[PDB]
Amino acid sequence: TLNGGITDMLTELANFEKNVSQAIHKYNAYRKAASVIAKYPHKIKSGAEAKKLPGVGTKIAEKIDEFLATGKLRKLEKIRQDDTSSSINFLTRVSGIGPSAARKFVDEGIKTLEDLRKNEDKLNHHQRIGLKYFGDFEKRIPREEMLQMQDIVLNEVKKVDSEYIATVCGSFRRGAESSGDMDVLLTHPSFTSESTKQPKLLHQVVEQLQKVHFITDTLSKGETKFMGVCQLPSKNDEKEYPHRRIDIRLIPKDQYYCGVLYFTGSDIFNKNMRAHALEKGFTINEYTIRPLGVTGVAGEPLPVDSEKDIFDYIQWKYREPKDRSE
DNA sequence: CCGACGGCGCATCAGC
DNA sequence: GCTGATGCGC
DNA sequence: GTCGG
Ligand SMILES: Nc1ccn([C@H]2CC[C@@H](COP(=O)(O)OP(=O)(O)OP(=O)(O)O)O2)c(=O)n1
């Protein structure tokens, strides 16, 4: 907060473009812009001044201006009155529900938490579990709770296989005071860039979190990526914790540093980082960094021994996690 | 003025 | 069934 | 919507 009023607006605008407009570049434009301005250590006084930031542009600057002058932005207000827009916006807040579902659902008359609650049969497993946890999904997990769950997945994993190694990523890793969700990066000897790779691995751990009731519901699950719900065990007579999204990604043991870099994000930060890499003649993914130039065809992965080596290749000072919001 | 925008997992559907 | 696309997601 | 060619 400094320029919260600004970032908010951009955020709203970005939500619009993405849910309603289905103009994903404009969505990306708005968020980068909001993240840069969020790091900005001064209270912006004008658009021009914002313009000096990378990602802030001419339009966004006129807006910031009407904004600073009126405390508002018409276009937002006016969007705010559109009904089709409010439904989509509402619907898209349901996990599993995105731009196209929300429009067909709107088209078919489903448009409120009510319409939804009586039409579970028209949803997919995904959206049904999302409907189910609708407000919980919207709550911030505070840090002390994060410390509790970590402890659990960790302790649980050890139990399945001493060898497994799980690490809590996303906003947590970035030292946040409250996450949004739980992101678990996991590895095991047995599965490497050239392994006879075991689907047993993600499975047995998922299983183990189940039997312990940590894990309550499943959103998706492949042989390397699991996406579901978990929850902390409540004390006698104490009212239970909300349900949380938890993501567990299984990574080749060996491509760990690329793995952790990726899962720690931010998403904006990675977006920015991967881009700079291209610039620099590279192409970074969760597995490897590879040379990629002129012909556009990439080459063999360069060796890496730390997250650091990935910043090195691209000419960037190491940015510890706390510095990853963008 | 204009092409490109990070890179990839899992679910679902149609084509065959 | 498989392959490719599209949705929605991290 | 912006950026960089
Ligand atoms: N479009 C995205 C979204 C996410 N990720 C990466 C960023 C880190 C990891 C975890 O993602 P989230 O849990 O969505 O984000 P977070 O930074 O952990 O934030 P939150 O507190 O909202 O979970 O996935 C990404 O590369 N690209």
Ligand SMILES: [Mg+2]
């Ligand atoms: Mg997260």
Ligand SMILES: [Mg+2]
């Ligand atoms: Mg997550």
Ligand code: NA
């Ligand atoms: Na700018």
Ligand code: NA
């Ligand atoms: Na959604």
